[PDB]
Design a protein around this ligand. Sequence first.
Ligand code: MET
Ligand code: NA
Ligand code: NA
Length: 502
Amino acid sequence: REHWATRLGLILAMAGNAVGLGNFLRFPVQAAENGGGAFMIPYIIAFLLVGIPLMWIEWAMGRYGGAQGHGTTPAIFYLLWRNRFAKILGVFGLWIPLVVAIYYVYIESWTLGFAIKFLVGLVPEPPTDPDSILRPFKEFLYSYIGVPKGDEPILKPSLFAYIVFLITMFINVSILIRGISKGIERFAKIAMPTLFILAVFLVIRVFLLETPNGTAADGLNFLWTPDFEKLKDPGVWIAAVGQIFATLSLGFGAIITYASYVRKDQDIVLSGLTAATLNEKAEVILGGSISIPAAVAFFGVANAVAIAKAGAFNLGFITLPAIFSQTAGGTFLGFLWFFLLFFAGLTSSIAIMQPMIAFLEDELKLSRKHAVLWTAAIVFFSAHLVMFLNKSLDEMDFWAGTIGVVFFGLTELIIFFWIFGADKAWEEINRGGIIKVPRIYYYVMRYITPAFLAVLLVVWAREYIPKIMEETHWTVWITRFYIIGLFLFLTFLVFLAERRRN
Ligand code: MET
Ligand code: NA
Ligand code: NA
C-alpha cells in the first residue's frame, strides 16, 4: 500500500481536505442566516459532540482497513461486520463522494474562471446606488453559468465556462495521477501555506474597510455577539450540525480514504485533532472575517443578512466582488479572493475523487493512471447534468451533501462503535496515538453522538417525506433517476470486486 511521506504532509493533506469552499462560502451564509453570534454556540457544541468524535472514528476506520489494503467503506464495513448488507451500506462511501465531486468540481471551476477574468481585468465596471453596483456583477455571474431570465429548466453555460471546467478537470487529474505522497502531499505542502497567507492578507485588507454605512468591525461584533433567543430554534442546531458535517468532510468517505494511507503504527489522534483545529481556525477566524464583515461594512448588518439569505453564491460571487470594485485595486483584490477560493476547492476535490480512485485500485486492481482517468471520465460526463440542468446541483447537494452525509455518519458510527465493539473500537482509535482521547469521549461516541444524529434524521425525514413526492420540476426527477443509476452502477462494481475476490 502507498503511504504518506511525512507527518506534516499528512496534516496538510487532511487540512486541505477539510478546508474548502465550505469555509469561505457556506459558513458565512449559514452564520448570517442564523443570527451571527447565536449560531456560534451550537456550532461549537456540535463541533465537540459530533465533529471531533466522528473525525477520530473515520481516521480509525481508515487506518484499520488500510492496514489490510482497503481504503473504501464497501470493504471496510465488511471487515468490521461480516455481512452483504455491510457492503451495500458501504456503497454510500463511493456514491456520496462521487455525487458531491460532480457539482463541487464545477463550482471550483467557477472560482478558477473568475480568478482568471479578474486577473486579466475582464470584469464589469460599476459607476452610489447599491443595485446599480450589484446588477452588473449579477449579470456577470448569470452570463458565466448561463442562468435563464425566469425560472427555466435549461442552463446555457458560456463556452469559456465549459473550457475552464475542462481545465479544472485537467488539473485535478494532473495532481491525482502522481499518487498520495508525490501528488496530493507535495501539492498540499504548497497550496496550504499559500492559502493561509492569502486568507490572512484578505482578512486584514477587509478589516480596513470602513464607510458611512458601517465597518468590518461591526460585522465581527455581529458574528461574535451571543444571542440566546435562538437557542430554542431547532433550525439553528440543524444548521450547525450540517455545517460541521460539511466543513469537516464527515460522512463523505474522504477522511477514511486518506486515513487508509496512514501506516498502521502511526498516530491518528493528535494528527486528526490538529487537522480539525486547523479547519476550525480557517473557518471561524479567516472565512468568517472576510465576506460578512465586508458586506456589513458597505450595506450594514440588516442588508448583509438580507444578501446572505438571498443565496450562497450571491455573497461570494456577486456581492463581495462588487464591494471590491468600489475600492482602489479592488479588481486585483477580487482576483486574490477567487484564487484563494480556487485552491480551497481543489485541495478538497482531489480528496473527494480519491475514494473512487482508491476503490478502483484496491478492489478492481486497476493501476493508478487508469483509475484516475476513468474516475475523471465519469465525473466529467455526469457533470453535464449539473451544467445544463437548472436545480440539478441543488438536488445533488441535498441528497448527497446534506442527508447522505448524516445518514452515512450514523451508519459508520454504529457499525464501528456498536457492532464491531465499543472497546475494540476505542483501543483501535487510541493505539499508536501520540496523545490519548479523553475518556469522556468514549461515552460521547457510544451514546450522545448516535442519539443526536438519529433524532436529526428523524426530524428531517418527518419534514421532507411529504415534500418529496409532490415536486413540480422535471429536472429534479431526471437528476434523482440519474444518481440512483449511479448507485446501481457502483453496486454492480462492488459485486464484480466481490466475485473477483472469490
Ligand atoms: C472535501 S468535500 C467536503 C467539504 C469541505 N470540507 C469544505 O469545507 O468545503
Ligand atoms: Na480544500
Ligand atoms: Na472545511
